[model samples]
Target: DYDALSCKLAAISVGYLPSSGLQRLSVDLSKKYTEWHRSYLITLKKFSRRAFGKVDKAMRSSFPVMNYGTYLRTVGIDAAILEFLVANEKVQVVNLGCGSDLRMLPLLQMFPHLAYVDIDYNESVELKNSILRESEILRISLGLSKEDTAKSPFLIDQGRYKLAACDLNDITETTRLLDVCTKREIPTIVISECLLCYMHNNESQLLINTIMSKFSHGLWISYDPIGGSQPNDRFGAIMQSNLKESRNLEMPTLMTYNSKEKYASRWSAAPNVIVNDMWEIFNAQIPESERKRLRSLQFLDELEELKVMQTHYILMKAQWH
Candidate 1:
């Protein structure tokens, strides 16, 4: 699943696009860069204090996208694909574990007619709503008059969307979530970005089973870390440790199909779009100039000093009948 980790890295890289674009839309690049630099320094200091070297190393290896880039790309591709699919057809976009993500706005822009269902913990959902409102205010404050701001597609109407809070670990709550989509008769596209890695394999499998059972035609797309070449590798251990720090550390369950034969046998009823070794795509996208910039003494030295764990992302697109 090291290959999966790579894909996860790529997904995070792509996730940066909207936020970066939004920053540019509301503020100049200089301000954005300053904010980013400040945030990076704070994050670096926090990690340094905790000595989470393994996490840092894995993050640095993802190339120009950086850590968050890998996550964003993984989920971004899923949302982008679904936006087209939903717009062309009629489908529901169910964002699982959605936490302050702007992907919904992009999706709505691409497919204005598409309905959306965003699910997360109560706190997360509340935070997301607040963030959305705050972002709108920011946009309007950035010289866009109220009329122009109101015309912005990013300001999606609440009528076409629904937000729910549920403990995904519970089957009853999961079923209720599905009921929402079932009532709407919309094929569901479920995205769990950086969420599955926090659960045990059995728990993840159970959720997958539940998803298949609840939605008539459903797809699950996710981005998570895979164990390195060796189970006990320094990178792997670091990942385990870092995840634990967030209280999300759980055993890695291998849900990835090893081959076409395996997938056919195990998930024949489930059509999927699975990409392994996501870093390959990200690395390909990183121009030489960007690589040189990342390889500079400041960045490289920082990376070397902190031995971070390497994590690859998995992008799986699966549809169930």
Candidate 2:
């Protein structure tokens, strides 16, 4: 478990380093850009460098596909959030298991009235707090001053940003942790990226039910890997075996919710839900001009593998009315 936890954290943190650099450079060059991707990430340079010290050429070579996929995921989620905010006029965002992501910084910048909360394990929260406390760049980016850190190391109760620690599997604790927003009955958008796959069915269900029951109206956006349709699906089987054997990580619903129909059924109780594989979203939803710019950045030699990988992951949006 310890090994897996370390691997998971490193994977989560390191995965963004290259992509952040790429996005920052893209924005610096005045190319097709996403507003938050560059500026928000710029503040995390020190943290990312420490997490991934001295990345070699081989490591650089390995990141193109991962970087592109990350870009697509960010773009899709940002678009959804923008749409939700436009329609609702005012909304709070709760990012479940949000680790080392700079999303709130940008969102807060764009929408001063937006209330954002980030929840994660105690250790992760501590590390994030430490980063915010220590880095003047990050603090300034969040509109926090040195006095702010000295006053509250955890930086809770800041203007629109709140950070809390909780074991997501513990229902009572999770409920209490979210009381700040629940008590106000704020219209909310809950985001979970690659979170449920790591959780047991019961735990995931509890979270789903809790959000739906607590929020009068909201949106739940989840991004996760889905297994292949067939029982003998080689890619899914191999992925399962490798993660299980290598890291002792289990994806409880990867196979069970393997297809769009099957995965969407998990949230069938919610009204007006849409689920799409990344490939479909990439082709249909992402603008062709942006796609052209992305492709122009690098030559993709493994197009087939890229398509297969993208298909295995899906974006699911569920609206609670």
Candidate 3:
């Protein structure tokens, strides 16, 4: 039932695409829907169609604050990757649970020494492969000739870019895929956007520990909502209750590691951890020029509510050596 939550998230990013002035989503989105039907599993298609229909209803009007937060997140992670590539001569990026994220192709285009891997469960990976495997743009993005794209699927490019499938909870499978696509000693940046907190606290922690113990030097970037920690804060409790009743969705860490400090504490193995609520990141990290540009996209009528909402979500970067 919640399997199609990936599509909803993908739809949000599609909403964020033009608002952020990014252009590739139309191509990817079309491919996603096309593949959904082509595969011919009735229930899966029906489920995704329902999710797609719901997102379509929201597409009529822009959700300014929601889009703003999504834009900020994309930019924040982009800047982190930018800084890492600048400081290191060579690096590989691993994106776990990377549902319909088109970042890998573009990043490979920008740097000669960068290798990118996109990992997800089987269906999401297959859906993405249908896009990548069919599109000449993806092959071109890697600067590979049409001749390079011959043979089946084109899921792996050996030393450059790869598409993999695995549940992150499977630590052994995760470690194996990571080792296959990445050199252990090269600087690696692992990204999880709205990914980690979906697991049980223990499952998520084991993944963090698993990756940290494997990569000698690298960074892990994560984004998730926290259950509020203050005595009078009912936001976390209400959110947990509401989401459960509405969607049967469970956010384990929102209440378990319910504050900025506690959320960052989960990354105990990381040598340096930076945690910032979205509100803090917007004010401190986003330049005023960008804020003004975002403002021009849509007028946010309830800035107060936006701030309060943002405080419950965080962006964290955990660096290790």
Specify the highest-TM-score model's number. Answer: 2
Higher-TM-score candidate of 1 and 3: 3
TM-score of each: 0.60, 0.82, 0.81
Residue-level error in angstroms, candidate 1, position 68: 7.7
Compared with the true structure, all predictions reach lDDT values of: 0.49, 0.68, 0.69
Instruction: List ranges where model 2 is wrong by over 4 Å.
Output: 1-50, 54-59, 145-155
Shift in Å, residue 131, candidate 3: 2.5
List, residue by residue over 3-71, the lDDT tens digit for candidate 1: 333333333343333233322223453244333323332343443444235434454566542443443
Once superposed on the true structure, which residue ranges of model 1 sit more than 4 Å away at CA? Answer: 1-68, 71-87, 133-157, 181-185, 230-232, 245-273, 283-311
Model 2 TM-score, 2 decimals: 0.82
lDDT leader: 3
Sorted on lDDT, best first, the list reads 3, 2, 1
lDDT of 2 by residue, 21-119 (tens): 223223332221233333323333555664333232323444556655666676667667878886776789999988766667656766767888888
- On lDDT, the stronger of 1 and 3 is 3
After superposition, candidate 3 runs with Cα above 4 Å error: 1-51, 135-139, 142-159
In TM-score terms, candidate 1 sits at 0.60
